[model samples]
Target: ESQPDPTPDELHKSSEFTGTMGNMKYLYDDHYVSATKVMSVDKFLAHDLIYNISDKKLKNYDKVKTELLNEDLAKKYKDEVVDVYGSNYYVNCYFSSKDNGGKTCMYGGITKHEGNHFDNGNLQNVLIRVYENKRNTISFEVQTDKKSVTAQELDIKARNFLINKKNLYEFNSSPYETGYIKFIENNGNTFWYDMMPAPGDKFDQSKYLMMYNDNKTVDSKSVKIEVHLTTKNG
Candidate 1:
């Protein structure tokens, strides 16, 4: 049986249709990283989504070193963060290898307790990694404290952070309205529904998001969400 074609909205939400494309590698034994794309930071921020992954306003790497408690990370990343400002920290690192064609690489990571993992109910830390090379290849990877949280849990948390991001800067008088819902039902379980921004449109005008259902049972409860971002010029 062939799958039906995705609607215009689904196309817009697709990672490939918008923003910069990259590979997602896993620390787990999956040697093969998945190909994923995220919306550019500038485009995503224009919609007023706010998240605390980076403090773009905090540009001075010197200040970042002083404020950051992870001395080893701070020192190791001095070179990577040198050319990075606060605004495009994640995007820059995500595409670092593509931009800089050398052994040069950058990394940004932190730990938070804002949410709990599925396995432990309690939470540990999250790790984000980016590797850039002159070969025009970049790697954006995410890891967990590994004590309690599952890889699937980490993936979903990353997506949720993107979806629930607050509007730090401004609101549009004429904001775009693109939302819809769909349901999936099996084994007497109710259908699944989601409401989010429109997906397929002009590349620059599109928004991207991804959902992963690691648990396929009808009544299963393993799902994750992630928001996408694109570069302003990409």
Candidate 2:
């Protein structure tokens, strides 16, 4: 068969090496190979540190913008490679299949302190999901801004933090059997609360019904609670 049209110094060193096809052979016993141009996902989000990416290092984000529109996915968004004797090196990386987006591709590029933002010391809860295989739940909203807590004292602190953390016979066990919180007043001293959890309790999503502060003059850092989970084909 055939296999020879390369030589122009191996076509100028595979046209100056551009990566994403490392199926092993940067140079086995041969020495020339090539791969270049492909980069898409709108040209890798127009470079510049991925276009100033920084939301405390980003997360999931619609599956990292759908794998940056896949331009051969650089070895599934790899992040490191080397081939010394073959004079090849690599480092393509794009993650976000959610695990907090592969943890910002391993500790989101350092700055330290990757522990206990709230694993114990409690009080730091925020999750408003409505995704269950087929996603349903067209609306939801929970709010607070602290002007001395009202809207019936956050509806009795969201019914005393959902009956002291979601269990007590599944907190009333009725509105479709366990998952309800409601409070509203968004006019003169904003206050809000809303929740729903019945459709198979959606695997209880690691439940955390905390939210506290029995008004010791309000300052839980000026209180702020906002949850809005709206789906149903949104």
Candidate 3:
């Protein structure tokens, strides 16, 4: 009544070429497939180019690192994934479960270690969350080195130029309503702010937020965030 064991060749074929998500390799099992062995969140950002929502061009490591909104601040929202109900690819992604100390499959690699980072989070703003369910919050810190803007007065705008880039209205609510932004810390123009994804809202897993300056031409820097949502009981 049982099939033969999966061969090494079969597993290799399932890997879909060497880990495309940075140091994270994809592990294939008869029961599941997962991204494992991730050391850097930036690498995942680099591969997905999710950090730079304003630009699609390939970027250097330096540029990529500076633009990552949630790199060091990942710990601020640790150990919790905002629970939500949705059915989109990005929305479905938020429902993944991570095993804190037990054996289980992890889908995202950036925060795989016991306390390295948080896991998937739910999205509330999506229209497809049409099912009868609720959404939780994902609050995290966002920092940018752009010194041109004032701290207390800095306008942090949460907009999705990526993910659902082409169709903003597809979701049930305004994008800003989901990931609301506010200026919190400012050390002589070293911009730092809090990006709190509202309970039952929608957003891409990792992407940039808009931080604007009055004196400059475009008047803004990109403050990114990656909202990971995974269950605690995995």
Q: All predictions: root-mean-square deviation over Cα?
A: 17.7, 24.7, 21.6
Please give the distance, in angstroms, between residue 177's alpha carbon in candidate 2 and its true position after superposition: 2.4
Looking at model 1, report the run of 10 residues with the lowest lDDT sum: 167-176
Across 1-234, the per-residue lDDT of candidate 1 in tens digits comes to 223423444433222323221111111112111111111121111112112222223331211111122345343433331222111112222222243111111112222223322466533444322111112122233444333232334433343333333220112110112222222223333222222323332222111222221111121132222222222122
| C-alpha lDDT score of every prediction, in listed order | 0.24, 0.24, 0.22
TM-score of each: 0.20, 0.19, 0.17
Candidate order by decreasing lDDT: 1, 2, 3
Give the number of the best model, judged by TM-score. Answer: 1
lDDT of 3 at 203: 37
Give per-residue lDDT, candidate 1, residue 68: 27
TM-score sort, best first: 1, 2, 3
Model 3 Cα lDDT, one tens digit per residue, 1-234: 222332322221211222222111111101111122322222233212111111122221111111113434333313323111001112122211242011111121122224222234321121111100124343323232222222211221122222233121222322221222222222222222222221322332222122211111111243222321222122
TM-score of 1: 0.20
Candidate 1: stretches off by over 4 Å: 1-123, 129-152, 160-211, 216-228
lDDT (Cα, 0-100) at 53 in candidate 1: 28
